[PDB]
Structure 1
Amino acid sequence: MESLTLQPIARVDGTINLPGSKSVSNRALLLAALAHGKTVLTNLLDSDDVRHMLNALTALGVSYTLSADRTRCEIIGNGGPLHAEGALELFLGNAGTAMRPLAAALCLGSNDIVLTGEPRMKERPIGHLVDALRLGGAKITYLEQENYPPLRLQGGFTGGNVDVDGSVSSQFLTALLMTAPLAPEDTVIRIKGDLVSKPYIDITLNLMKTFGVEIENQHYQQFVVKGGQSYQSPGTYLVEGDASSASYFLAAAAIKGGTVKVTGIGRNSMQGDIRFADVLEKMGATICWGDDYISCTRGELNAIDMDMNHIPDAAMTIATAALFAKGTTTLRNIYNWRVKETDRLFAMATELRKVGAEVEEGHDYIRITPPEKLNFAEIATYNDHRMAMCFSLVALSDTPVTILDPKCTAKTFPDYFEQLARISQAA
């Protein structure tokens, strides 16, 4: 078991050029593969989730080339649905943005493909998506536990009236939205009730528009899609920097700055996690907005009590930043933390208590009362990139912290610790 020990960081200050957005990167790659023409993506993220998507596209027959640093990709569009037979297995690692979107897209036409991944992926739900795809005509088989990967897809999604549950993940609706335009018949997608992580649907619709497709969004309760469409290459496309990855560095400044500026995202970004900056401002930090940067300067840090459903991933960063705030912080309406890279409510509460906090682990919320002073802990990371990045902030105090399995950050940010060190100052 590898580990990394972070010594106390006296102050943070500096500029970080953000790695590419994982959410945008995987959507752009799949749309480029389905599109007609050559797409040149720049500022593409090089991480495990993107590598698994690229490997899947290679296995499906898509041609592309990558630059030396793997941030520039020239993709040759397939000009329509991707195809493979013989129960070809695509191993998708831990990537939800490959698993959910491909589970839907590969249901177009006739195929015989199996989707699987790491053990944890076999524990992340996909039943709501499968239910919707079947209503549209798809033939899908669960090879292990019902409602979870791995899946054998045999095609048949033609469109029609499809209902989808949006209460657990926005990725199921995202997958349907990307797939429906290419189906032969028109599709009306009806949301059964609530829709969580709503800002990610805006990311999906933005990418679809870039690739030539628009749909009718009726107040996020129903989406009307015309079938028989085709995606078209936009030529060159610049991938936004990752706003979720930015959260760690902006929070670092709110706690121990200094001023930290992140470039690659700004006030015009399509990512919902830029709203993380507004939470730091509510806590007492100073935020500066630019067209291609967001910066945070240390002010003060006061506890908050907020519904975080609109920024579930960046909300985890507030949970460790809360260790440094005045008062008790409560983060609400975050049930799906339980079904991601690990059960994050269980994990976050467990590890926060290890450094001294008093924590109430609610079914769908977490309440955190910081200790007078933090203590040392060897932090378990649950094969979850965000547990490692969130707990790295413990070192912005008088105590060191040891992070187990630091390489798990590679899901979205292989160079995380090098970047945190770049802004760490001794004076």
Structure 2
Amino acid sequence: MKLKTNIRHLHGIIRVPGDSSISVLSIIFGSLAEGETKVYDILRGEDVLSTMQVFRDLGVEIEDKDGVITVQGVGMAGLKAPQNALNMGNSGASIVAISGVLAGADFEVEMFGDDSLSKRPMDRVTLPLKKMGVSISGQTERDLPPLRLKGTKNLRPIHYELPIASNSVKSALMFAALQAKGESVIIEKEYTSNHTEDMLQQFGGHLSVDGKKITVQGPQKLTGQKVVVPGDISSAAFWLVAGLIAPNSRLVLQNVGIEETLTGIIDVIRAMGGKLEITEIDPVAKSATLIVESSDLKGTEICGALIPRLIDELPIIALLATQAQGVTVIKDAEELKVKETDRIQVVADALNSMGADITPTADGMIIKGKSALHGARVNTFGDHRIGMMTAIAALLVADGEVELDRAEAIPSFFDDLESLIHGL
């Protein structure tokens, strides 16, 4: 597919979608809890929709009306035997998680998905789940979907250390541990997200964390909550950059979460000369409206130390630095892992193919700035961030075309970008 090019203005309101994993966690916890759960600002993901539908299939009443999800919890042992095979679409996140949720379900269950999903190994979750006494098994020893599962009323606690870092596996094992009789210890390899830990506690459950050591006593009961899903971090960062680098631009970005990643991106922006106003702060919700305008940017130091999720935002932040006059050094304080070093390379390659001046380094990248961008062909390679980066990069292209073939990347993104192209 080609990409919209050479726009002369950008105006409108974008409302940051909710975080996906908190969205998903809220449906899960909402079903397993007692009492009614309400979720506000949920992400309209296909992953959220599939997860809600999985739970409806296990007998949970879930209402989607006027922007609000209302879940009537069925208790920690209240999942019922489905009358159909469970559809998880292309979310591998979902299969892993629900597998742990269904550790204690005393009935047979099938979980399938699409052609992409059916190529992703599940043995990373089936191995520890089996130790607990769950029957779960996929295609080949790798356990490719479809998965066949039977949990048990005699779930044994888990003592396991992950060989690979994985928030998905950590979550499934926690959900299972919540249903097991006794003390589970789960030890992660690397520090991954705390979403499940946080939400489990918000839903009234107890754990103990000691570094990478997670201890969970089962069985537990949870209580229905009102959940306000915070704005996605990556999406908020994405639009901020767009509204700063696009010509004749003003974006009102609602529902931005006030947490450290945006906080540190905000400071970097200001340091660079960005025009950004913070408004409508909601101190209880920890959200704000951000207003950005077209800015004359100047290079700066970007210490990944000062921005947690930085690696996620590398594509959109490199585009940013590409547009600032002078040198931007992005140096990460901690060593890069293979996939991080790879992400830098792919970003540098694509933007340099469009006229940027990016030098990958052992610790990040050097960017030499205000690059008049030009046409190019670049494939996403699955990474939507890299794609949407290229989309905004495309708007800045004076002449030439921008081919971006594997732009399976899906959601309402283009309608929005069109919306902003004709506002004033």
TM-score, with normalisation over the residues of structure 2?
0.79
- CA deviation after TM superposition for structure 1 residue 368, in Å: 6.1
| Equivalences for residues 25-424 of structure 1 within 5 A | 25-67=23-65, 71-81=67-77, 82-84=79-81, 89-124=85-120, 126-144=122-140, 146=142, 149-156=145-152, 158-165=155-162, 167-191=164-188, 193-195=189-191, 198=192, 200-201=193-194, 203-219=195-211, 221-234=212-225, 236-256=226-246, 258-267=249-258, 269=259, 276-281=265-270, 285=274, 288-289=277-278, 290-291=281-282, 292-295=287-290, 296=292, 298=295, 300-302=297-299, 304=301, 306-307=303-304, 310-325=309-324, 326-327=326-327, 330=330, 335=337, 348=347, 351-357=350-356, 372-399=371-398, 402=402, 404=404, 408-410=408-410, 414-424=411-421
1:65 partner SS:
strand
How far off its partner does 1:127 sit?
4.0
Read off the aligned partner of 1:318 and give its amino acid letter. I
State the AA in 1 paired with 2:65: S
Cα distance in 2 between the residues matched to 1:299 and 1:17: 25
> How far did residue 77 of structure 1 move?
1.6
Q: Is the 8 A contact 1:266 1:293 kept in 2?
A: yes
Shift of the 278–194 alpha-carbon distance from structure 1 to 2, 3 Å rule, reads: farther
In structure 2, the CA distance between the partners of 1:224 and 1:360, relative to structure 1 (3 Å rule), is same
CA shift, 1:32, in A, is 1.0
Q: Distance in 2 between matches of 1:328 and 1:262?
A: 25
Contact preservation (8 Å) 1:273, 1:311:
no
Counterpart CA distance in 1 for 2:185 and 2:30 is 24
CA-to-aligned-CA distance 1:379-401 (integer Å, 9 cap, x gap)? 43345443432221113424365
Aligned CA distance change for structure 1 residues 120 and 334 (closer, same or farther; 3 Å): farther
Tell me how many residue pairs correspond in the alignment.
Answer: 407
Q: Which amino acid is the alignment partner of residue 196 of structure 2? A: T
1:108 counterpart letter in structure 2: G
Q: Report deviation, 1:169.
A: 2.5
Structure 2 CA distance for partners of 1:265 and 1:118, relative to 1, 3 Å: same
Whole-angstrom distance in 2 between the partners of 1:274 and 1:16: 19
- Point out the structure with max Rg over C-alpha: 2
Offset at residue 259 of structure 1 (A): 4.9
Contact 1:383 1:405 in 2 (8 A): no
User: For residues 242 and 38 of structure 1, do their structure 2 counterparts lie closer, same or farther at Cα, with a shift above 3 Å needed?
Assistant: same
Contact 2:322–2:371 (CA under 8 A) maintained in structure 1: no
SS in structure 1 opposite 2:25?
A: helix
What SS does the aligned partner of 1:264 have? strand
Superposition CA RMSD, Å: 3.8
Partner AA of 2:36 in structure 1: K
Residues 71-102 of structure 1 show CA distances to partners (whole Å, capped at 9, x for unaligned) of 3222222222434368x532322324423311
**Kindly tell me: are residues 53 and 391 of structure 1, through their superposed partners in 2, closer, same or farther at Cα, counting changes over 3 Å?**
same
The AA in structure 1 aligned to 2:314 is A
Structure 2, unpaired ranges of 5+: none
Distance 1:310 1:136, change over 3 A: farther
Q: Secondary structure at the match of 1:107?
A: helix
SS of 1:186's equivalent? strand
Deviations 1:327-365 (A, max 9, x none): 365576665858xxxx96676455434423466778996
| Cα distance in 2, alignment partners of residues 280 and 65 from structure 1 | 41
Distance in 2 separating the partners of 1:364 and 1:140: 42
| Cα distance in 1 between the residues matched to 2:271 and 2:6 | 26
Per-residue CA deviations over 1:259-301 (Å, capped at 9, x if unaligned) read 534222332x5x8566544554565535555333152453524
**CA positional deviation for 1:6:** 1.0
Contact kept, 8 Å, 2:185 with 2:215, in 1: the verdict is: yes
Residue identity matched to 1:19: P
Letter in structure 2 aligned against 1:52? S
